Design a protein around this ligand. Structure first.
Ligand code: HEC
Ligand code: HEC
Ligand code: HEC
Ligand code: HEC
Length: 107
């Protein structure tokens, strides 16, 4: 079993670093974020050294940080994709979950 790291993970793969708090995701499906890859859910940083570390902020495939992070119809529930949905028409949750310059993901 993977040992989730302490909350406060800082995602600085890009110019806009975001802190991920597993605590706010411990109730999520560890397989929904680290979906089953290579036959096993890669329980490692989303932008692993060759996973979502694409700084093109345009790769709309399964190998671009931005995409999986701002896209919704992704192989799995993405960051903003699970956010726009975890908000349930909640301008308050939509500004915190999907809010880019005024949410929790982009303090
Ligand atoms: C952090 C916990 C992660 C999140 C959030 C996501 N991933 Fe990944 N990821 C990887 C591959 C090879 C794919 C595609 C799998 C396939 O269909 O063969 C994906 C895909 C996504 C997507 C959607 C991509 C798309 O729609 O094109 C999202 C939104 C996504 N992942 C979120 C590989 C990896 C990986 C390799 C080591 C890791 C650690 C992660 N993904 C982590 C996350
Ligand atoms: C990409 C791997 C992720 C990052 C970076 C963040 N999330 Fe999420 N997230 C989810 C829920 C259910 C919540 C709480 C909703 C609520 O109670 O209002 C959150 C919250 C956050 C926050 C702020 C929360 C806080 O400050 O306490 C940040 C900064 C954040 N998330 C970043 C759910 C999901 C989810 C569903 C599977 C996914 C894939 C992600 N979050 C991904 C990321
Ligand atoms: C999405 C809501 C997630 C769930 C559910 C889980 N993890 Fe996660 N994890 C997520 C992100 C955004 C990142 C990287 C953020 C960054 O700062 O780059 C990670 C990272 C990890 C790591 C660190 C990478 C490493 O050193 O291997 C570990 C250790 C990890 N995640 C473990 C883990 C476990 C055990 C989970 C289930 C309890 C789990 N994560 C769920 C996003 C999400
Ligand atoms: C939290 C679920 C997010 C929301 C809502 C938005 N973005 Fe985001 N963005 C998120 C993460 C985890 C990251 C990477 C953190 C890091 O710095 O490593 C980003 C990054 C960006 C970037 C950086 C692009 C790059 O330099 O490669 C941009 C340009 C960006 N985000 C834009 C953006 C927009 C337009 C959004 C509103 C829909 C938005 N983000 C929301 C997480 C989240």
């Amino acid at each position: 079993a993977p040992k989730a790291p302490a909350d406060g993970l800082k995602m600085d793969k890009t110019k806009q670093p975001v802190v991920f708090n597993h605590s706010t995701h411990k109730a999520v499906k560890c397989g929904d974020c680290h979906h089953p890859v290579n036959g096993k859910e890669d329980y490692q940083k989303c932008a692993t050294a060759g996973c979502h570390d694409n700084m093109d902020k345009k790769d709309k495939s399964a190998k671009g940080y931005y995409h999986a992070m701002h896209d919704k119809g992704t192989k799995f529930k993405s960051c903003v994709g699970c956010h726009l949905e975890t908000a349930g028409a909640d301008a308050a949750k939509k500004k915190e979950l999907t809010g880019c310059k005024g949410s929790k993901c982009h303090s």
